[PDB]
Amino acid sequence: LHKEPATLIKAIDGDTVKLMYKGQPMTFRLLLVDTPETKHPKKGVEKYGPEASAFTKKMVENAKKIEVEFDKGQRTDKYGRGLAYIYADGKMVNEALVRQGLAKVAYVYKPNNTHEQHLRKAEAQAKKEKLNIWS
C-alpha cells in the first residue's frame, strides 16, 4: 500500500471526513473503526460521539499534510464513500481514535484488514488504560 496526498474539505463525524482527492470532492469512511456517532437515527448522537467527532476534526484541521491509504480490497462502500486509512502529519487517525478509547475496531472484512493487528493492539491498551469508551 502507498499513501497519496489529499486536502481537508470538512470533517463530518468521528468516522467520516470529506476530502479533496485527485481534484474531486469525496467522502471518506475511516477503515476498521467504529466510533460513537453524532449521526444516524438508530442512535442519533451517542455517548462519546461529540468527543470522537471533535478529536477527528481537530486532528485533521490542524494537520500540515493529510494522506489517504487505500487497503487491498474494494476502495468504496455501498454509499459511495472511499474506504481508507487516513494520516495527519504521519499519524494514522484511525489508530489515534482507537488508542484513545474513542473508537472500537469494527467487524473486519477480508481483504481490507492490513492494519487490523496494529489497531487491535491499540484497542487492548486503551482497554487496559480504561479510557473513555472503556472507562
Report the C-alpha radius of gyration, rounded.
Answer: 14 Å
- The largest beta-sheet arranges its strands as 1-2-3-6-5
Structural class: alpha+beta
Give the DSSP E fraction (strand runs of 2 or more residues): 25-35%
What order do the SSEs take from the amino end to the carboxyl end, as H and E? EEEEHEEEHEH
The level-1 CATH class: Mainly Beta
CATH architecture: Beta Barrel
Major β-sheet, in short?
A: 5 strands, mixed, barrel
Number of helices: 3
Number of strands: 8
Helix content: 10-25%
Number of domains: 1
Protein name: Nuclease A
Subcellular location: Secreted
PDB class: hydrolase
Keywords: hydrolase
How does this model look, in words?
- This protein has a single domain, classed as OB fold (Dihydrolipoamide Acetyltransferase, E2P) (Beta Barrel), CATH 2.40.50.90.
- The chain is built from three helices and eight strands, in the order E-E-E-E-H-E-E-E-H-E-H.
- The protein is globular.
- The termini are far apart.
- This is Nuclease A.
- It is found in: Secreted.
Please tag this protein with its features.
135 residues, alpha+beta, OB fold (Dihydrolipoamide Acetyltransferase, E2P), five-stranded mixed beta barrel, two-stranded antiparallel sheet, 24% helix, 30% strand, globular, Nuclease A, hydrolase
Task: Describe how the helices and strands are arranged.
Layout: E1 4-13, E2 16-21, E3 24-30, E4 33-34, H1 49-61, E5 66-70, E6 82-88, E7 91-92, H2 93-99, E8 104-105, H3 116-128
Parallel strand pairs: 3-6
Antiparallel strand pairs: 1-2, 1-5, 2-3, 4-8, 5-6, 6-7
Helix pairs in contact: 2-3
PDB class: hydrolase
Keywords: hydrolase
Assembly: monomeric
